[PDB]
């Protein structure tokens, strides 16, 4: 996260770290959506241009974390993966369209003060909140700048951007399965996700029921926090039917 701040303890209890077994390193962010399911970006698991194609046994999920590097004894919980599900129409070839994956844990994780699932949006909540100017929150342990790394989980609040501005900021083809967020050059404030934040959640707190909803998944951006560029997020609600089909079929 670029230009963010240290998270408060328990501020993002659904935050998940995807962790490579060997070498031991941060792979990506992710989120907890129930006691057995974790949501992330497909490109965290499959990305042929970088020779990335992880299998279940390559990875661990670490939940309840604050410190990036420490083993947080008695706080974090580490889970093995039963199965990875990548969207069948995930477009790694072109523009990361439908950049979404689910991971089922081998055993359920115990909720605690530091571990708790985020809500997924219904159509109504999505329609109410996914509006230009409305701010969401992005969290992760990714790099602090484009070209170092944080001691603890970072947080930044960012405004959703008008689709035409999103489209005009890039030569990449934008789809309805993406939205973008970030400040414009003129707005003074800044901030963005960066390398290593991929797969983490973009959340909004509903003013209707005071619950946190994951509206987006950190997906892509040209650089990190560049003037005139924006962060692009997987549109979680637009892909909810697939999410439900997977959980219903393999739950």
């Amino acid at each position: 996260i670029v230009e963010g701040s240290d998270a408060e303890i328990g501020m993002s209890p659904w935050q998940v770290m995807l962790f490579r077994k060997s070498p031991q390193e941060l792979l990506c962010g992710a989120s907890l959506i129930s006691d057995r399911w974790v949501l992330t970006a497909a490109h965290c698991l499959l990305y042929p241009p970088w020779d990335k194609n992880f299998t279940e046994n390559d990875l661990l999920v670490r939940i309840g974390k604050h410190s990036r590097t420490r083993y947080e004894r008695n706080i974090e919980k580490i889970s093995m993966l039963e199965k990875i599900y990548i969207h069948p129409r995930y477009n790694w070839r072109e523009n990361l369209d439908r950049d979404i994956a689910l991971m089922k844990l081998k055993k359920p994780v115990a909720f605690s003060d530091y571990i708790h699932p985020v809500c997924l949006p219904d159509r109504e909540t999505a329609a109410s909140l996914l509006q230009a100017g409305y701010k969401g929150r992005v969290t992760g342990w990714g790099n602090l700048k484009e070209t170092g790394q944080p001691s603890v989980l970072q947080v930044v609040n960012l405004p959703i951007v008008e689709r035409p501005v999103c489209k005009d900021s890039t030569r990449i083809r934008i789809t309805d399965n993406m939205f973008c967020a970030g400040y414009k050059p003129d707005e003074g404030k800044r901030g963005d996700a960066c390398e290593g934040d991929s797969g983490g959640p973009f959340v909004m707190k509903s003013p209707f029921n005071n619950r946190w909803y994951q509206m987006g998944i950190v997906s892509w951006g040209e650089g990190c926090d560049r003037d005139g560029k924006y962060g692009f997020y997987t549109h979680v609600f637009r892909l909810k039917k697939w999410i439900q089909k997977v959980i219903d079929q393999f739950g």
């Binding site: 408060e8 303890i9 328990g10 501020m11 209890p13 959506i33 129930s34 909720f111 605690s112 003060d113 530091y114 708790h116 699932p117 985020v118 809500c119 997924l120 909140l129 100017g133 409305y134 701010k135 969401g136 929150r137 947080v155 609040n157 405004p159 909004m204 707190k205 509903s206 003013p207 005071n210 619950r211 946190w212 909803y213």
Partner: peptide, 28 residues
């Protein structure tokens, strides 16, 4: 499930984090 999105150390205790007000103020 029914308890999703309510944080043990915040919503569950009626405590607010330092910047959630920024989000609310943007929901115009």
């Amino acid at each position: 499930e029914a308890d999703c999105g309510l944080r043990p150390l915040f919503e569950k205790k009626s405590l607010e984090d330092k910047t959630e007000r920024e989000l609310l103020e943007s929901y115009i």
